[PDB]
């Protein structure tokens, strides 16, 4: 399984590296999409912007629930773009939301996977079968905690949370 990373800033301050293992052996299509968006491999998408998480933000953070990001298109939670040229199907729901660090796809209903993702800060069992789990934070979960700290009940952060750098680790 490939391992990818985010180097994060919170309020402009470096906050650490989040390291994620991608379940390519369980969700090959979903993993590859995420992995590719970490490296920037694919270049420019249909949106005219690089297919790359680098520089994008966590725009929706709810403490005790999850941190959501992945909109490198509009940078406001409405955008995002997969590497397949369109939204892609829910590959499978084998993996469940079993606790903190769970990496899963945000969507707009069935078969609408783009680039928006979320990292759980607890068990989110109610999302089972609706959101494709495809990864797990394996290092730097404490960095996710720092992100969680600036969240709110509305989801608005109170400091900008930015992916300062990102890519593939192994």
């Amino acid at each position: 399984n490939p391992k990818v990373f985010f180097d994060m800033t919170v309020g402009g301050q470096p906050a650490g590296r989040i390291v994620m293992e991608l379940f390519a052996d369980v969700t090959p299509r979903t993993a590859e999409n995420f992995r590719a968006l970490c490296t920037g491999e694919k270049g420019i998408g249909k949106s005219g912007k690089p297919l790359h998480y680098k520089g994008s933000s966590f725009h929706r953070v709810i403490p005790g629930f999850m941190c959501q990001g992945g909109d490198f298109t509009a940078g406001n939670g409405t955008g995002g773009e997969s590497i397949y040229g369109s939204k892609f199907a829910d590959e499978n729901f084998v993996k469940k939301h079993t606790g903190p660090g769970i990496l899963s796809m945000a969507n707009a209903g069935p078969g609408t996977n783009g680039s928006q993702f979320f990292v759980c800060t607890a068990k989110t069992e109610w999302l089972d079968g609706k959101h494709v789990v495809f990864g797990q934070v394996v290092e730097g979960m404490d960095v996710v905690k720092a992100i969680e700290k600036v969240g709110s009940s509305s989801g608005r952060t109170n400091k900008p949370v930015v992916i300062a750098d990102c890519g593939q680790l192994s």
């Binding site: 929706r60 709810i62 629930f65 999850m66 959501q68 939670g77 409405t78 995002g80 899963s104 945000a106 969507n107 707009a108 609408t112 783009g114 928006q116 979320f118 989110t124 109610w126 999302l127 959101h131 989801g155």
Partner: peptide
């Protein structure tokens, strides 16, 4: 509620 959607944020 506690959802994670992309466009229309629900309760």
């Amino acid at each position: 509620x506690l959802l994670v959607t992309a466009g229309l944020v629900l309760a």
